[PDB]
Structure formats: C-alpha cells, structure tokens
Symmetry: D2
Subunit: 499 residues, 4 copies
C-alpha cells in the first residue's frame, strides 16, 4: 500500500502480493492465502514462484546479483541502507499495521519492531568494526622466514535468508543488512504464514537503490524452499527457526556456511540477593511478550528458596493483571498466537505439567481458537524434568517456576533442557554470577535483565539444540563472509637480511 502501489494486485477483493524475482515482481506459481491470527480471516494472498522462476531467480542472483552487490562500493551500500531506513521510518504506521494484522503483534510491539528494523539499517556503519583484515609477519617460524601474509574477508556470494514468523520484519531486514553490507546478494524466504512485512521491506530497499538483481523474495511454503537451500549457487544459509527445520535445512544443504538460530526457550535464575521488583517485572515481561512467541522468551524460572515465594508471587500478579484480546487495541497487553494449533499444544503442555505434579499459578484459560492467558506453572524440581514444558519449547506465553536450594541446582536445572540460547541471572554477588556465567551452556547470559536480542548490538545465538554461530552487529560477518589468505614469498629477494 503506497510503498507497494504498483506491486500489489487487488484480485477478487484480496490484495495479492507477488514474489520479487531479482529484477521484477511476479510469480506464476500457486497463490497462497495469508491469514490473520486476530480473526483467522484471509487478509491477502502471495504468489509463489514456479520451479522455473526459482531456478531463473537463482541464476540471476548468482550470475549478476553477486557482482551488483559486490561491485557497489560499501559507501554506496551504506547509503542504500540508510535510505531504506528513511523510507520505512516514514511508512512506520503502515509497517506496524501490517505487523499487528498479519502477525497479531500488539501495536507497541509492532512499532518497536519497525523501529528495530530502521535502527538496524542505520547502524550498518557499526558492522564495519569487524571488517578489516589481518597482516601476519612471517619471521616467527623458520619455515616462513622472508614470507608474509594478509588475511581478508570476502563475501560468499548468494546468502539464503530463511526467516521465522515471530519477527517477520526485523529478521528479514537484519539478515539482508548484514548479508548486503559485506557485498552479498540475498534470497529472502519468509514464513509463508506472514510474508507481507518482508515484501514491504524489500520494496523499501529496492526504492532505496538496492541493486535490483541482487535481492529476491520468494513466497515458498516450507519444503518448497529446500530447492533453494540445496542449490550450489547458495553459498550460505542464515536460518532462524525451529531446531527440527534447522536440522532438515543442513541435511538438505550439505557443506555450506551456516548460521542457525534455533531458539528454544530461556531459563531465568534468581539468586537470593536479587532485586525482586526488577526480577519479577523483567521475568513477567520475558514470559508474555508477543504471547511468548519470542525465541528469547522465559520458559523456566529458577529461584533460590529465600526469594522463591515473593518472586513467584509477584510474577503471578503481573501475569494475571494483563489484558488479552485483539492487538489493534493499544489497550491489550497480549494479542493472539499465530495459529489455533499453537494454543492446542500449549493447553496440552499445561495438562501434562499438571498431571506430573505441576500447579498453575496464573492463567491456564484458553480464550478462543488463537487466544490464551499468559500461564505460569509451578513444578517441583524432582518432577519438572519430565514435563513437556521443560523438555520442549512450547511457543506460547507459558513458563514453569521451580524452587531450588542453591546456585548449583539452578544451574543444573537450567542446563537440563536440550536448548542453550540465552539464560538470565538476577543477583548481585560477583562470584555466584561468574560461576553461573561459566557453567550455563548458552550463547548469551543476561545479568539483571530479561533476555532481549534487540537489534543484535550484542551478538547472540545458540548452544546445544539452539543452533550454531552468532548474529549481531559486526559478528554476523563470520556467517556471510569467507576469509581469503594471500601469502607473499620474498625468500632470497633481499627485502629482509635473515629475518
């Protein structure tokens, strides 16, 4: 709309969003309905590309896109990204509305995501802190005497950005930004569930000057994307999604550069010396934000005996005083879950917990096909480990609360889930904190705050089932870039005199 005026086709009353085929918007594959979790109604349709168009798109990205991206100097790439930030920023309300509608994201969250996307774009300048190369003098070994080395980063070529439904706008902009800033072409494949924000972002980027043949947006459902991942013209795959799909992706892709942000939930530990007001507030928010549909959502709360009571009490109060419903109301604190299935699973997971000795301390009530109350289930340490809510990631606003004797048990229980994305620790004692930081097997630990990846100012990523590699300003360079070593031989050439 406006930004997409010439792109969208209103066929039979429903806006039809086409795929961007590295040059022209189009697509002659099956059309797919995009629905809102707010009312299960179809709000648009996306045109998937045919196998022939996928193939043609990859060919363009590979034969020309790599070069258009690479041959645009960084100073210009930065201008493109800054311009795109401006376009998105002036179309903020439009971007947010689509997030609220297409993702069921509360207005404030949708606005925050648009702003995150804008900031990410504007701070592409900070990604340069990890851009320089290394100069290795060769006289520190006899075999390399009169020799010298230069190690540089080079873009890999075509990066496939596969994105999840819970951050349809930001994830796509983030991956495109760090992939492009370093000189790569990019194939974005958004969740077929809410692909509208990506289409809007890609349009803003194209309007900003992004090399037209260096980007592609393909509306392909699940396994249709395998064809992209398995293709040799795709040198890297930046994937943010579930562990299970991530696994399938690597198995389909084979040898290639990967960044796998596979989520799972996050445990939060509260030491006896923690500021419980701060802790309860951050933990409650960590549990419910975007209806827990955040990879960094809190799924397990571990608190030492002496503060467990108050802490769990406060979090319960906070979760209970939340307003659920339609996200269009800036009154609502919690909108719907992406699908009735996600709610089904959450309900089943809560029953499992209750059956295994668990007790609901807040929530528990399903309010409709896609609506539920943020639930907080207490569980005894000796039984929690077998609970579905512990063993798995229930993508919903639901967390377990478990009282623990001391730090070692908290740590042990925190490390007992199969995931290792982030962990939170509230407390003040440097020694206990240092111990926790050392022993928690996670990509990131947040001291005195809820886990929040934000725009990646600080790098993040998983351990164990949560994946491999990191995303972040500067650090993402490792996933979309390859080193290039140049060794110079001056043996006997008179540069050095035996040294």
């Amino acid at each position: 709309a406006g930004l997409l005026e010439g792109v969208i086709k209103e066929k039979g009353g429903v806006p039809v969003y086409p795929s961007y085929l590295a040059g022209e918007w189009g697509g002659s594959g099956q059309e797919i309905e995009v629905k809102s979790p707010i009312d299960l109604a179809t709000i648009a349709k996306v045109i998937s590309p045919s196998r022939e168009e996928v193939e043609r798109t990859l060919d363009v990205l590979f034969k020309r896109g790599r070069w258009s991206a690479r041959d645009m100097p960084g100073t210009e790439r930065l201008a493109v990204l800054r311009k795109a930030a401006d376009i998105i920023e002036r179309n903020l309300d439009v971007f947010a509305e689509v997030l609220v509608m297409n993702a069921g994201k509360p207005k404030s969250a949708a606005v925050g995501e648009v702003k995150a996307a804008v900031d990410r774009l504007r701070l592409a300048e900070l990604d340069l802190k990890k851009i320089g190369g290394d100069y290795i003098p060769g006289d520190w070994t006899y075999d390399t005497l009169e020799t010298e080395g230069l190690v540089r980063r080079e873009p890999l070529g075509v990066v496939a950005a596969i994105t999840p439904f819970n951050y349809p706008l930001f994830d796509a902009v983030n991956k495109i930004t760090y992939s492009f800033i370093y000189g790569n072409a990019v194939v974005v494949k958004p969740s077929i569930s809410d692909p509208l924000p990506a289409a809007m972002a890609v349009k803003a980027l194209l309007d900003a000057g992004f090399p037209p043949d260096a980007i592609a947006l393909l509306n392909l459902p699940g396994k249709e994307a395998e064809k992209i991942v398995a293709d040799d013209r795709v040198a890297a795959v930046s994937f943010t999604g579930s562990t299970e799909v991530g696994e399938r992706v690597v198995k389909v892709g084979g040898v290639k550069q990967y960044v796998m942000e596979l989520g799972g939930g996050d445990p939060a530990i509260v030491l006896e010396d923690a500021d419980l007001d701060l802790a309860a507030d951050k933990i409650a928010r960590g549990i419910y934000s975007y209806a827990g549909q955040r990879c960094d959502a809190i799924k397990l709360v571990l608190a030492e005996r002496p503060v467990y009571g108050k802490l769990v009490e406060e979090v319960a109060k906070r979760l209970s005083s939340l307003r659920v419903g339609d996200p269009r109301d800036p009154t609502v604190d919690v909108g719907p879950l992406i699908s009735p299935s996600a709610v089904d699973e959450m309900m089943a997971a809560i029953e499992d917990a209750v059956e295994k000795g668990g007790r609901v301390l807040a929530g528990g009530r399903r309010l409709g096909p896609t609506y539920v109350q943020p639930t907080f289930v207490e569980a005894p340490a000796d039984r929690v480990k077998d609970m579905v809510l512990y063993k798995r990631e229930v993508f919903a606003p639901v967390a377990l609360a478990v009282e623990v004797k001391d730090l070692d048990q908290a740590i042990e229980l925190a490390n007992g889930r199969p995931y290792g994305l982030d962990a939170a620790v509230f407390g003040r004692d440097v020694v206990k904190i240092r111990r926790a930081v050392r022993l928690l097997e996670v990509g990131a630990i947040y001291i005195n705050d809820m886990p929040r990846h934000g725009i990646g100012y600080y790098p993040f990523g998983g351990r164990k089932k949560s994946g491999v590699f990191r995303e972040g300003i500067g650090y993402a360079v490792e996933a979309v870039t390859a080193y290039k070593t140049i060794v110079f031989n001056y043996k006997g050439k008179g540069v050095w005199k035996y040294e």
Copy 2:
C-alpha cells in the same frame, strides 16, 4: 614400537594396533589389515571398536572428557603439547619410518611431516593470539544505554577429527592441537588406510599427560564413522577429505560446527614478468610432491603467451629428471600412490585428456600397480574445460598446462574448476597481482611460491567445492569454539549519569 611397546599386540606375526577408547587401548570389533603402497603387503592390523565401544567411548568423552580437557588450565595444556612434541621428536626415525612404510611417503617428506607435527605442537602458544574476548560498551545506542557486553570464546565440547590418508600424522596432530588447546575433548578417526601414525601420536600425547578420558582414537572404516558424526554429543566436526565424503558428513551430522577442508587441486598462474626459474622449480615441485597426493598440489598451470614455452619446457625437464620407485631409498624423489585404483584413475584421466586434444609433455608411463611417472599434459584452452583432469581432482602427480592470452583468461580458466582451495601466481606487477588476488575464488593465494599449507602459520581452507571455514594457527579457534555473550544491565543503577 617402543612408544607403543605395551599397546601393540603381535598376533600371528603382524603387529595389531588397537583403538584408544578414551581411557584404555582395546577394541573388540572386526580386525582390519593395513597395507603398504610400497608392496601391497599387510604391515599391521588395527582393531576397530564395536558399536558398544563406540557408544561407550562417546559417553566418556562427553561426560568426562569435556571436563578433563576444560578443567586442565591452558598453561598445563601447553605443557602437555610441548612434552608430546619432545616425545615425537626423540622418536622421529620411528615416526618417519611408519610414514614411509604406511603411506609410501618419501623419506624426506616423512621426516618433514614429523617435524611439522612437532612444530605445530610447540607453537600452540601462538594459537593464543586469537583467544581473548571483546568488551562492548553499551552507550552507542539508546536502547543499550547503561548496558555493557562481554563476548568470550568457550570450547564446544567434543570435536570429531576425521583425517585423510595423505597426511596421517600431521592432520591428526593439528586437529588435536587446536581442538585441545582451547579446552575440547577429541575423537580422532584416521583413514583406515594408514591409521598407524595417529595411534603413535595419540600415544605420545597420552604419555605427555593428555587427559586420558579426553581423547579417543577409533579405527573405523568409512561409513562406520557416520555413527560418530551423527551423534549429538559431537559438537563439532573437523573434516579434511574429499568433497563427496564431506557432503555426506554434513548430511549425516546436521546442525553442528564444521570445518570442511575438501581439497581439489590448485591452479598456478604465470605472468609474463615472472621469474621463470623460480616458477618452474616451484610448479614442478607443486605437481609431484608426495606423488601429487597433496590437497594443495598444482593440477593446472596457466601461463601467458610470452613465457608459456620456456615455463612448460622447464617444468617438463624437471618432472622428467625425477627418480621414481620405493620411498625407503633416500634416492627416490617419488614413491607410490596409496592404491592401484588411484593410478588407474590417473591413467584414465590422461587418456581422456589426450582424446580431447591433450598432449603429454612429460611422464605418462605407469610403472606398476602403485607406481607412475609425474605427468604433465598440455591442453588447448578451448578444450581443457571438458577434460577430466580439469573438471575433477585426479589425486596423483598430474597437471595440465594451458597457454593463455592474458591475466583475465588465466583467471577465468583458474576459476573454471569446481574447486577453490588455493591458487598460485608468479609475477611481479602489483596491479596484475592485486587483480588476481581479488578475482581468484580461493581460500588462499600464494604469490611467487607454490601452494604449501605447512603447519598453518597462515590460515587456509576452501571456497566452492573445496569446503568451508579455515584451519590455521589462531584461526582454527573459530571451528572448535563457540562465543558466549554476557550482557550486564546497570539501567538506573547509578554507574553512569545518562551515558
């Protein structure tokens, strides 16, 4: 022998080498014969572990090895590696003999490899140049104000080191070194073809004090190793081998940290201003060393019109004046190829070349089941691209020679193979060299020298089919280590006053 006095079992006149099961040498799986390429005779047997022992070994590595390695401070780890270097160095002749016998490596090459292994071990101190972490101040964004970050490296746990036959000693020592120096446990799986050097190295390491439950040596043939790669207790897989196996490995392994050094050959470019004496000498050596059974061997020579003649002439002379035969003779320049099959393929590849317009300029004569002459086949640019020797990696002492008009054609032809490991460029003009460095799609470019990874003083690794990620002193940290981000929240705590 001596180092392995209590380990090896002389059963029926043939030394029987057992697997090391992270604690004790043993194995109750099938026994497998190890033969010498020098005479196709069985020189020993290795005991493969049973499925039960593989499983038990992994369990030990995971439950205890990770901790024994990690909980040994770096200063002690360095002492272990230095001690191991001493043990290997005093047993040099024994190490070299086994290389000559088991791998068919010429005496000087076998001695050089033992020395490379010793140096690698002693320079583990240089790997620390990439060990420190990053401190990220948070006041460069509003959302992160009064926040701070620490980014650190942490060992992944259990690294599976899969090694090729062409550098049985060094590769195993290299992977063990960089995996261990950072605190990881390691499962070494050597080529079942020549696993004796690894067994000797692992023994020297164990004698040096390497945590007995933090290392394992498993004599498993090909697909028997899949069980290790596919296991979740294996957090990283450092693989050096062929593209095809590398592909299978990732597909079996799924999401995990990988370093894939997949070889392929290397092209060498000679500019009109090159010192042709240096070039011919380095190129000849690059073609024949260890009977071309080097991932960094020269497989294609591209020379500009004006020097093509002399260059190809000189390389031909040099290859022709080489002494082939048994590697025990310090007289021999070239020993045998690892198997009669490898020679078969080389012969077939030479015929293919000849049929497509190629002309042998040196060699071409097979001298026995496992012996051949270093061959240099000239080919016209317009036909070389379809030749098996160009399209594939023929692991043998054989290279193609192709005359080219200019740098652009040399570069184009060099980039036309499916591999991108290293490339060599002989010439003096900075501009032409810089252009070549920019356009050659390889992990490493050697200016005025033949490609030689050495001990990894300079990082190396592939592009395209040659794999992903790099190995090298300092740089290998990226493959066996994961980042850990710790974010500290001091918002409103009075550390800063709005800043």
Copy 3:
C-alpha cells in the same frame, strides 16, 4: 557571519572575533589583528583571553567539561557531530570564503577542506572500530590461574588541541572530533595567524549541541599557549606543527599523552617501471598544492636513471603551466604563501641550492611579498645532502629533483633527510616496492599516488623529526584515551576447578 551573528563584534569597521571560554564567547586580553596573505590587509581581530580567563577556562573544562563530555552518551555525541556536519555543510560557501581569504587557499582547496571537515564529522561512526576493550582469560600462567582481566579505554579528560595555519579548519575539526567522540573535553588553540575558521567550526559545534562547558577556543599567540600545555589539568596534547615548536611543547608539558604530527616534507621515488604520466601528475600536484604549504608536500623527487629525464621533464612542464595569483579567482592554481617571510626563506633556499650545484628546472621567480612560482630544483646526488632544501623543510612550493642509480640509493637519499612523515613510491614491481616499504623510515608510504592524509581514513604520523604517534579514524583513540585494566580474583572461589 550568520553562524556567528551574535558572536562577532564590528568594532571600528573590522569584525572582532572573541575567544570561546567554555561557556561564553568573550575575552578581555589584548586584541590581535588577523591578516590575509592575499593583500597583507587586516580582515579581522581576535580577542585573546587574559591569564585570569585562561585559568578560569581550564578550571571549567577540568571540573565540568570532562564530565559533560563523558556523561553525554556516545550515541548523543555522534548526533552532535552529525548536526555540526550539517551546519557546516549548509554554510559551506561562508566557510570556504574565510579559508580563501584568511589562509590564501585557492577556492577549490578551501572547498575541499570544508568538505573534509564535514566528512570527518559524519564518519565519527567509523572511529568506533577501535573502541571495544579486551578480555584476558587468566589460566595461561600459573600465577594468574582463577584470575581474569578486562582492559578498557577511558577518556583522559582535557585534551589540548594545538593547530597549524595550513589547515585551520580541518585540523581543528579533526582533533575535536576524535577527542570528543571518546568522551574528552577540548581546548582548541588555533594558529593566531588564521584563527577564524576554528571560531566558525566551534560555533557550528556549539549550535549542534556540543556540551558548552566541554570546549574552549583560545586565541593565544605562540608562547602564550605554553600556559595551557604546562597545566596539569591538561592530560593530553594533540599538536600538529613544526618540529621546533613540538619540542618546546613537550619540554613545557612534561609527562603527558602526546600526538606530535611535526611534518617536514616528503620524498617521492620513481622506479623505472612507473607509469610516468601518473607519477609526473601526482608529483607536480604534490609539490604545488596550497603553495606547498602541506606537511605532506613533496620536497624531494628521486628517480632511477632510465625515467629521470622524462619524469623531471613532465613535472617541469606541469609546474610551469600553473596560474599563480589571487585565490579568489577560481582560475588560479596557486595562491599566496602565508607570509612574506615564508617566501624570503624559499628564495634563500633556492639560492643556496644553486650555489651548491643546483639548477632550477621550473619557477624561481618571486611575484610579490607573498607570491612565488612553484619551483623545481635539480641537484646532483653528491651535493644535494648539504642543500638547505634537503636538510630542512622549506614550507613553500619547492622540491629538489635527484637522479639515482637504483632503489638502494633512492632509499638512502630518501632516508637522509631528518624527517620521516610520508614517502611516495611509483612503480609496479612487488619486490622493489616491498623493499622500499621496509626500508623507508616514515610513518606512511603511498604506493602509486602522492602523499595525501585526507581525513585520516588511513592513519598517519611521523618518524624521526616528524614526530610521534598517529592520527586517523580509529587510531587517534590511542592519543586521547588511557587504558583501564580491571583484574578479577576468583582464586579458591569455585568458579574454575584447577583451570
């Protein structure tokens, strides 16, 4: 004017520019006339501060400025600098006019300097590439086991920026930028010769939001500034000027953090394989730009026998075809020298050269008190070393030309001057270039281009008499920042288990 509407006082027909006293513009010290080199006419007056005001200003900078600068978060500091860039950019013509008038800078050079200042301000974001700190794990030594270190950069406090006359605008903006971006307060002391551009820049910065008590502009003549340098509240002194004053500054300042950019000229070497069109063009420009009043101006040209003739011929032609005169004419290539004295010295230096066997190849004619022709004096290698033009820096558009047998003699002669700022080398052979790069004792070597510090995209600074330390985007952090090491002791605390 406009930007300075409320600041400047028109007393007796001459605009009177007051000093900025870290809070308010003013000054009750002697008034000093500012003249134009274009016509020796007084174009303005500057009010110097009294001893009491200097003292009061320092007190404010120290007691409040350090904190205003430091307590403004970086994100805001960046906004200030970007805003200042905008203000200067919209007032470009006004900034340039003052440069042309006050410095005698040709219009295109004055415009280029304003743009350099604007870019420097906008790229302050790139200075962050060197901002993070280091995390040092402690288990690599026994004495530091269970210990850990964090190394961070911290602003020093009050940086005294002393600037030269030849880049009155840029130098002041550069020093203020890198000093401020890291959290320092700044006392700018411009050349009393052309202090108007600094006053304008400081006003733009104040209008942009620069903490009013964190900056000071003091119009003090020469030794009046010693009082600032010698003060203990001044933690660092960023000085760009002559060797002799630089020496006096350190001797007055004593222990303190220093960056001393002390110029001197630069030698240029032309190898036999150099593109002589490029060389002659760049060298000619390097000799005459801003009437040679550039620290990086070419003062000596060394060319190998085979190209000496053509090279010197071409440079002579180019210097001869230059238009001298008043800088207001966009027709003029060369304006006047800052003072009649500077011309006197140049004439004397040319006579000295001629007397010692030197021969003028272009120029030599003085055209007025402050006007002269760009002069190129040929000199025999065996006599040049004793020539004033070689031994000293004659700040004027004058260079010596000396034929040399080979690289070694060029290098020897290039290193024979007492300075070591930059050096230029035109040629293509990597070996000769590498040798030159190794042996030239200078802070920076420019391959195939004239020396040009630009905005410091690449760090620069001197060796020998040219000073110490470097300025540059990112690198200047070392001069206005101090490290802060935090060592954490966890011995026996149970974080690690013997490691």
Copy 4:
C-alpha cells in the same frame, strides 16, 4: 660470579662490575660504590662509562644495534630469550643472593623476582598476540575508493630502559624483553643504587646470544643519564621511577615515544560485603611486601563503617606479628629500606600524621638506620587529606586507614591523592564494583585482591601523577613500536569496477 667470571674485576677486595658498552664490558669513568641496605657496607663497585664511551655506545646501538636486533628474525629472538631464561634459572640462587644483599629483599621475594624474570623471558611468545597489523579496505569512503591500506608495527630503534631500585632484576628484564622481542636495540640504565642484578641479567642475555652490539648497560648516576635520554638516537624511553624524575626525563628528552610508570601508592577499598579475612590478609601483605618499596603497595585503606573495625583490627594484628631484621634469614618477613633517608622520611610522615589527628594502630618504631616496623596509621576523613602520608608517596611500609560512610566517599577519598596507578576493591556486589571501576581514576583496579603487577600478564600503568602509557605482555608493544601505514592506489587500474 660464575656467570660473570671473566667480567668482574676484584680490585682491592671489592668486586668491580664494569658497564657493558654494546660490544665489550668496560668503562673508564669514575668508579662508584654499591652498598647493601642490610649493613650499609660496600659490597661492590660499578664502573661508570666516560662521556666518550656513552657517546660511542649510543653510536654503536644506533648504527649497528638497531639492525642486529631487527635483522635477527623473531624466531631467533625468542630462542635467545628462552636461553637467557634457562641461564638465569640455573643460576637462581646466585641471582637471588645478590637481590637479598644488594636490595635488602627478603629471600622469598628475591626468589620470586628471579622467577618473575625467568617467566617473563619464557612468555615472550605471548607478546605476539599484539604483533599483527591491520588491513583497511578503501571503499567505505568515496575519496578512498579503489585504494587500500596496510597498517604495520615497526620497531623504533634504540629504546632507553631506565629502571628503579625496587625491582632491579625484573624491570630490567621486562623492558629488555618487550623492547627486544619487537626488534629494538636497548640501553639499560639501572639505579646506581643496586645495578648488580641488571649486569647479571645482561650477561645471561649475552651468553644466550643476544646481539652483542644491540644492548648496553650503563652505570650512570642520576643526571648523568640525561645525556642518554636527550639524545636523538634514542627513539623511546621506558621509564619506571618517581614522578619527579619522570618529569625531568620528558623535559630533557622532548618529543619521543614514552612509557612512564611513575608509581605513587595505591588505595584499597573495602565494601561492607567483603570477605574480611581475604581483605585483611591481602591488604596487610599489600602494605608490607618488600618493606612497602613497591609502586603497587597499599598506602591508604578505606573501609565502610560496618566492617572498618574488624578489618583495621585484623590488618593491625597481621602487621604486628611480622618479623623484621636481616633478609638473609628466611625467618624474616621484612628486610631493610634501601637507605636511612627513606626511613627518616617515613618517621617524619608518621609524626605529621599524628600531629594532624592521626593514630598509629601498628608499628611506628624505627629499629635502626635502615630498619622500621610496618606502620598502620588511622586517620579521620576530615583531616587525612592534608597528611603527608596521603598527599605524597612515602616509599616505606606505611599506610593510612580511614573509615568512610559509603562507596562515594571511599571513591572520592581514593581519587583525592595525586596518583592513579592501581586501586583495590574488596566486595561482592556487581553494581557497587562496577561504579568503583568506572569512577576510580587509576590505570588498574584489582577486585578482591591486592594490587600486584606480577610479570604484566595484565597491563598496568598510571593515570594522573602515576604517569602515562602501559606495560604488559602484548601491550608494551605500543611503547617501543611505531606504526607504518602503506596506502596502495589502484584508481582506474581495473582491480575493482566502481567499488
């Protein structure tokens, strides 16, 4: 002795140690007596060099030493340093004895210093972590498009190492190590008070293979050394000593690279949540070690109301139960102070404290010309600031104890001394610690441990009157090295296609 068998001359019953003149041991200047603080008796004599020999030595260091050091490859330099470590280690008892005798250092401290020197030498390998250079791509600005930069470190040439009396062995070995590892020649000028350990170290280095013309040991008293510092052949001055001499050194030296470690004492802060056993123990030791003749000695103890009593009580007990006397007795905890003057000043400083309201809590008794008891003087916050013990550095085992209300007052009082070397903070709360770390104006803060520079595993150095720049493994490179920037111009050369 033994190591110095052919060097030392027994003239008139007293061993006569000559200076090392970059080639030969000798000296024809005045002879100077070296006395022991243990009994004021002359234990040896040192021959100072004549003005002619100083001049000749500098000439050798400059004309040949720079090259011998630089032209010895790093791999060999490392071998020299490792060999020297071996020589010193096998002569440990001899090295320690001279420390005990010449410096009055307790046996355990003397042994610890020899070991520190040995370790420093062996870990020279860790200094390489800061040796590589930077590669700066040029397409991030329009003016630098098609341009590229390489930034490298280069040795400065001749480094003058001026050392203090309190660590005669280590300081000399440290400065020589970091100066030499990077390729510099070195003039060591030890305290004329105890120059014997330096002579022994220099001999071990020469025996180890240290280029004979790249090192010099000059026995010059105080201002005789100015001649070295003021010389232009001296590119850097690494000085560890008092603020006042440091000031004189820079004023004599002028523009040059400096590292000024100017000591002063260190304050220690004890928060209410500190482990007081650890604190009292570390603080007591920090106060008395080597009779407080440590730049990092604790001179001021600040403790919050609630723990002040116990803390000061415990430290008093510990200081009181110390055994003073002759250092030869391994029984003694505290030997003598370097001179009767140092004791005089300490006594006067204690009286001043008492007169201003201070009360001795331990010690106070002078036991002889050079012996005293470790003294702990309590002082009220409102009067301490004017006490000599606070305002100055009394180089003796004496510290002030001051009770404080909270962290802010502790910090304020800690920052009130004119020095800023290190500071110690005992406590557990992360927020209070972070605040302290931010506000303490010192080069280094030690959390939960006494300040101990050790061998510089962690970098250290001063703020304010404590000097400028840092020493440390890796970090010292900045003081004895200069950057060298090489900019390559490929504009229009076809390397890049507009990028």
